[PDB]
Design a protein around this ligand. Structure first.
Ligand SMILES: [Mg+2]
Length: 210
């Protein structure tokens, strides 16, 4: 069930057991948290989930809690790696915003063997921002440079940035326990929505770049 936001353990990044998992490690992005919460763990291996924070960043700024998620798939012939972050709240100012935040970037490859980045999609309030072709100034090698930021009074959302960012231990949907996948599918995150549950393919359709 729901546990304290700061009591969800960080899920250690395992070794990649196959090429799917190795690719998601290889393309892990950088995140520049400009304002708002740092990313936190949303779920544990028993399927307990974060209770988040009431909108009211001192409670969500602990760098040791860093975590990133991913799920991989295909759409329209292209290979997609969705990276997703959970924040305990999305509150531009006191009395504005809501408990929980789920954001995601899609890294699009031509295919999983060639593994050329063809585009990037970053979640925002109106829908996905798209960089097509992927702007070289948003790439540190093959590492996408992403920002997390609220422009008041709008919710905190993702964007592309030239600034270097930080990385987090990655646990992939494909590496989770069944209890954790079940909890991410069924848990009510209120105004926020897990973007890599049974809605994954629908999100890829919205993130697609041409
Ligand atoms: Mg948000």
């Amino acid at each position: 069930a729901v546990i304290n936001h700061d009591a969800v353990p960080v899920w250690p990044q395992p070794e990649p057991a196959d090429a799917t998992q190795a690719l998601a490690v290889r393309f892990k992005p950088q995140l520049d948290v400009v304002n708002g919460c740092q990313p936190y763990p949303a779920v544990d291996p028993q399927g307990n989930t974060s209770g988040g924070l009431k909108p009211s960043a001192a409670a969500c700024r602990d760098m040791s809690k860093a975590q990133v998620y991913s799920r991989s798939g295909t759409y329209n012939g292209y290979y997609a790696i969705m990276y997703s972050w959970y924040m305990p709240k999305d509150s531009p100012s006191t009395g504005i915003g809501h408990r929980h935040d789920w954001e995601n970037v899609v890294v699009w490859l031509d295919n999983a063997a060639s593994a050329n980045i063809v585009a990037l999609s970053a979640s925002a309030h109106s829908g996905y921002k798209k960089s097509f072709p992927a702007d070289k100034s948003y790439l540190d090698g093959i590492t996408a440079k992403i920002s997390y930021k609220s422009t008041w009074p709008l919710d905190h959302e993702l964007g592309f940035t030239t600034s270097a960012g930080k990385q987090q231990p990655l646990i992939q949907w494909e590496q989770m326990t069944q209890a954790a996948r079940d909890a991410l599918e069924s848990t009510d995150f209120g105004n926020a929505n897990v973007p890599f549950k049974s809605n994954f393919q629908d999100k890829l359709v919205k993130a697609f770049f041409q």
